[PDB]
Design a protein around this ligand. Structure first.
Ligand SMILES: [Mg+2]
Ligand SMILES: [Zn+2]
Lengths: 205, 133, 181, 110, 169, 242, 51
């Protein structure tokens, strides 16, 4: 299951990975990072959502949010605020250089209005149907939650039932008829088992 | 079943029956040579050889001639960074022999760029090669 | 036969095995008890094939193809056991009104702390049992001082925990002074 | 008997760094005319002596495949032959040890 | 292909004994015929409950091979033979194995006694055992009447007891 | 307190990935595959899409190849309307010259904007602890866009450019001693510089990618010092063979 | 023709910011409109027997 020490420092690498284990062994104890408390309800940044960088090496650029870390209030954008690191290095070969992105705090980014490609501040609201949404403060317009592929990787629109995958018509069929009998009693009538012997009473203490 | 209360029995009482069993057994490959008819299992401690027979015959329709069990100790020698001993869970092993001359052999569940790189030239003496001048 | 402990021969050697979703507790509230008693054994046989594959992967020192398969089955086996127990619990409240299937009572142990005693099944009444009457469900007056010492111990712990939380919040404004609101 | 006082680093450097304690340079070193490696004038070349032991061991492994057991030594002489050689005029009635290898240049046939 | 521990067979250390039924001083040192009775644990009806119907006859001829080899081999040791000094003449014996109702007949001949690796390397010859199928002596016993009594089984017991050592001229 | 005991360097032996996984199985080290939606993002391609071979002696079938390049230009103009082909060769000179002046002052922060990630190591790795003095004396012949081709999620466009100009190069070693070249005399150079730009990326730009090395090129300038190329270091048992 | 269908989803999913602008403006209440008209034993049982 999950084995996280009390003051585990979250990072770019996922917990339990080989890189995180070496980085965060069970024994180390480091100063806890201070994170501004943000209500799960208030959080307004999700993966697949365009954001503009206010402060950093490359400010004023808009990019998609590929990853978000709630524990540290980090937002990762592809291709922006990126340094360079050699990947696939070996003892003989230097390795291949690639740009690696650096995490950004939720205060160093700013959401963009779909109508006007400019940074804007949003406040949550409710539509007619009652579904909660985020609306820009200036020139209020709806900003839906960008669709993002599932973590597991399954694409419902491209699913092929296998030999051990129940069909939709068999997994939604209703066969239950509310009664006043237990699985044991109901099964003994169907299987055909008969037991005439009685159960003598015991004492409980 | 495990982690459940068993209804007490008295002379002339009903037969004890379990409709849903939470015993989960795993077939394992023997470490040492065993006869062909013999099969090896790892079962929970609470399980008995009598249950393993009725469990196999009923659920998997396998006739068994003989069943033998042994309890295997798990080393509590390992120690953590706090010098506290770590216990490997003790487990039970079961040896089952098939009845009608059937033979079982464990199946094989796991059947089965670098030359495009250019190196440094000794004659160049370490001079950067990128420069065409 | 013993061929149900392993996966389809063609699947041997593959690194991935596509699998569907896990049964949800709500999808099982529509099936009958007879249908759930049949499904339990379909999942049981799939669970043993996955436990057999998980152990042979360690034997051959290789990674398991799709470990999530076992997690899905374990979640389905627990969800199914939740539905059956739910129907039995509701049926017990109507016929009897009891919230617990096993009898018990609140009692003080020899140490003086409250504990819920779960009864056992016996053939003779409790006043005849040799071994049950050697057990004590009452604390003598030499326990009172330790009960207070143990109560004062929990209070100190609960006090340090509450004072610590206050400190973190007071230290959390020095760096984020815009949290005054 | 225990030290009455602590010995100083100045006293100890004069004892530790006394020329008698120091390692003495060796002047008996020279090059082997065959391989070019270093050697002492009175000691055999480690490199050239090693290649004799590698081949000598292979010859002794072949001898065992002929004897086929202990306490089976012969009462005659022994000869080593390589690919491209036949029993000589003087190597008649001996135990020839066939070697699947070219005769070493340093190994002169006698 | 495996070791005897998988039969199952267990090891122990205790007094080693070579005993024919009496000590060496007893002149009657040659065996004629054994009679064995199978215990209740190996009863036929308990083997059909345990899906071991094919082991019924196995239990019969396993007792003979072990009981008769141990008897004939003990007769030879009394005469001075052992692994290095193998027997010069065969040693034979008989056995009647029964469970109370069914009867089986066996004959064993001890041709060789050299079974060690040092002595079994070049040994050509082997020990022999003959055995029949289990057949009932009686079909049923009701009150004071024995139903379906079989005389062929009784005659076979007599032939064993009738066999005698060849007489000299 | 403040105690950490460190062991000496281990220096793993096997470099290849296969041997690591081949040796991790012998040691029982099981490494389950990763699970993550985030993947890396590469701004430059690894290699050229279509190999270019300049005609020999430059220092029907021919006409068709020139048309194939013209087709690829259209793709480059679908993502950038204000782009002409009679200015890039004049623009490449600025990049080329400006990218080789960052090696003298070690301006790696701006060098990434001029060159790709595939080209940057080749230039800087060897001169990490060396002093370079490169200059552009004069230009002999104008540059020409010889070939333009694009790729078949992202799309990149490569523009091969031919350069023929004089250059001055003097490479000094760690200690300031002359290592290669002469700072006084320039020499003619004929090198085909390849550029790349990630059209999909809205912030992309044209950056140097690599240098085409024709098999018929003259030998490079000789180095100052001498070299010794040892022979096989044989074992005692093994003998030397011609 | 399944592979071709996959490309269409990535096209839109990659660029969703424009789709929102294309959609007509929809009125949104400053506060939840369906929340106001929609919404407008002992923890220590041993004391009951032991004392
Ligand atoms: Mg035992
Ligand atoms: Zn030498």
């Amino acid at each position: 299951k999950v084995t996280l020490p009390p003051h585990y420092r979250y990072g770019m690498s996922p917990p339990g990975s080989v890189a995180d284990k070496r980085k965060n062994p069970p024994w180390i104890r480091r100063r806890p990072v201070v994170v501004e408390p943000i209500s799960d309800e208030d959080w307004y940044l999700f993966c697949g959502d365009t954001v503009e960088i206010l402060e950093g090496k490359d400010a004023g650029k808009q990019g998609k949010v590929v990853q978000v870390i709630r524990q540290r209030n980090w937002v990762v954008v592809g291709g922006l605020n990126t340094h360079y690191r050699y990947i696939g290095k070996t003892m003989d070969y230097r390795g291949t250089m690639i740009p690696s992105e650096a995490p950004l705090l939720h205060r160093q980014v700013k959401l963009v209005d779909p109508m006007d490609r400019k940074p804007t501040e949003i406040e949550w609201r409710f539509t007619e149907a009652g579904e909660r949404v985020r609306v820009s403060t200036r020139s209020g317009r709806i900003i839906p939650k960008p669709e993002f592929p599932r973590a597991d990787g399954i694409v419902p629109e491209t699913w092929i039932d296998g030999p051990k995958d129940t069909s939709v018509e068999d997994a939604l069929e209703r066969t239950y008829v509310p009664c006043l009998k237990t699985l044991q009693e109901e099964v003994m009538e169907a299987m055909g088992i008969k037991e005439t012997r009685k159960y003598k009473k015991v004492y409980w203490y | 079943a495990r982690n459940v209360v068993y209804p007490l029995y008295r002379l002339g009482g009903p037969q004890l029956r379990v409709f849903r069993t939470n015993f989960f057994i795993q077939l394992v490959r023997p470490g040492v040579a065993q006869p062909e008819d013999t099969v090896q299992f790892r079962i929970p401690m609470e399980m008995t050889r009598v249950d393993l027979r009725n469990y196999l015959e009923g659920i998997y329709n396998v006739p068994v001639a003989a069943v033998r069990t042994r309890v295997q100790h798990g080393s509590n020698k390992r120690r953590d960074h706090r010098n506290v001993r770590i216990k490997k869970p003790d487990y039970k092993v079961a040896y089952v022999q098939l009845a009608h001359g059937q033979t079982f052999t464990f199946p094989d569940l796991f059947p089965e760029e670098r030359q495009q790189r250019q190196s440094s030239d000794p004659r160049r003496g370490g001079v950067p090669s990128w420069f065409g001048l | 036969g013993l061929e149900e402990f392993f996966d389809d021969p063609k699947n041997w050697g593959q690194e991935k095995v596509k699998s569907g979703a896990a049964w949800t507790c709500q999808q099982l509230r529509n099936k009958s008890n007879e249908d759930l008693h049949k499904l339990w054994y379909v999942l049981l046989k799939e669970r043993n094939m996955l436990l057999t594959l998980e152990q042979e992967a360690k034997r051959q020192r290789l990674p398991m193809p799709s470990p999530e398969r076992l997690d899905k089955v374990v979640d389905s086996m627990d969800a199914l056991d939740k539905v059956v127990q739910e129907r039995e619990d509701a049926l017990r409240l109507l016929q009897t009104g009891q919230e617990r299937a096993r009898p018990g009572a609140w009692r003080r142990d020899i140490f003086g702390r409250i504990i819920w005693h779960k009864f056992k099944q016996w053939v003779i009444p409790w006043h005849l049992n040799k071994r049950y009457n050697r057990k004590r469900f009452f604390a003598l007056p030499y326990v009172d001082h330790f009960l207070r010492l143990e109560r004062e111990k929990r209070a100190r712990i609960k006090a340090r925990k509450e004072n610590l939380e206050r400190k973190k919040a007071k230290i959390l404004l020095k760096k984020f002074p815009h949290l005054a609101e | 008997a225990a030290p009455k006082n602590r010995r100083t680093i100045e006293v100890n450097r004069c004892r530790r760094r006394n020329p008698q304690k120091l390692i003495k340079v060796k002047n008996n070193i020279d090059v082997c005319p065959e391989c070019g490696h270093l050697k002492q004038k009175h000691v055999l070349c480690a490199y050239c002596y090693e290649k004799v032991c590698k081949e000598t061991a292979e010859i002794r492994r072949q001898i065992g495949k002929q004897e086929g057991g202990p306490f089976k030594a012969p009462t005659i002489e022994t000869v080593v032959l390589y690919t491209g050689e036949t029993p000589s005029e003087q190597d008649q009635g001996k135990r020839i040890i066939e070697r699947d290898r070219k005769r070493p240049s340093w190994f002169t046939q006698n | 292909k495996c070791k005897p521990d998988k039969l199952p067979l267990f090891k122990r250390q205790y007094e080693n004994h070579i005993f024919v039924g009496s000590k060496t001083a007893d002149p009657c040192c040659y065996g004629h015929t054994q009679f064995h009775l199978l215990p209740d644990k190996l009863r036929r009806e308990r083997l059909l409950r345990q899906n071991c119907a094919d082991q019924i006859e196995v239990v019969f001829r396993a007792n003979a091979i072990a009981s008769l080899f141990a008897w004939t081999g003990a007769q030879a040791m009394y005469q001075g033979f052992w692994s290095e000094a193998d027997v010069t003449r065969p040693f034979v014996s008989q056995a009647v194995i029964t469970d109370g109702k069914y009867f089986s007949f066996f004959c064993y001949q001890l041709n060789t006694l050299a079974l060690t690796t040092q002595a079994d390397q070049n040994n050509p010859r082997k020990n022999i055992c003959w055995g029949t199928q289990s057949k009932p002596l009686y079909e049923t016993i009701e009150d004071n009447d024995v139903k379906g009594f079989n005389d062929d089984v009784l005659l076979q017991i007599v032939h064993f007891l009738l066999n005698r050592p060849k007489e000299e001229k | 307190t403040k105690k950490r005991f460190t062991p000496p360097i281990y220096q793993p032996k096997f470099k290849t990935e296969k041997e690591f996984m081949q040796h991790a199985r012998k040691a029982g080290l099981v490494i389950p595959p990763e699970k993550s939606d985030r993947s890396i993002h590469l701004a430059c391609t690894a290699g050229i899409f279509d190999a270019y071979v300049p005609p020999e002696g430059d220092a029907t079938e021919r006409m068709k190849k020139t048309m194939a390049s013209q087709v690829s230009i259209r793709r480059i103009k679908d993502y950038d309307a204000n782009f002409k082909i009679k200015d890039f060769p004049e623009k490449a000179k600025d990049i080329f010259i400006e990218a080789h002046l960052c090696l003298n002052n070690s301006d790696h922060d701006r060098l990434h904007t001029l060159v790709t990630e595939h080209c940057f190591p080749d230039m800087t790795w060897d001169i990490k602890y060396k002093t370079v003095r490169w200059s552009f004396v004069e230009s002999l012949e104008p540059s020409h866009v010889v070939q333009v081709r694009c790729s078949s999620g992202n799309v990149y466009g490569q523009i091969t450019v031919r350069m023929h100009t004089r250059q001055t190069l003097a490479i000094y070693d760690r200690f300031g001693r002359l290592m290669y070249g002469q700072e006084d005399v320039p020499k003619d150079v004929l090198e085909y510089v390849v550029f790349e730009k990630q059209l999909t990326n809205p912030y992309g730009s044209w950056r140097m990618h690599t240098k085409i090395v024709p098999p018929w090129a003259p030998p490079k300038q000789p180095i100052l010092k001498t070299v010794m190329i040892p022979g096989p270091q044989l074992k005692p048992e093994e003998e030397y063979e011609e | 023709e399944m592979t071709r269908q996959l490309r269409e989803r990535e096209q839109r999913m990659r660029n969703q910011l424009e789709l929102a602008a294309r959609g007509p403006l929809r009125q949104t209440f400053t506060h939840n409109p369906l929340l106001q008209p929609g919404k407008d034993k002992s923890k220590y049982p041993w004391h009951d027997t032991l004392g």
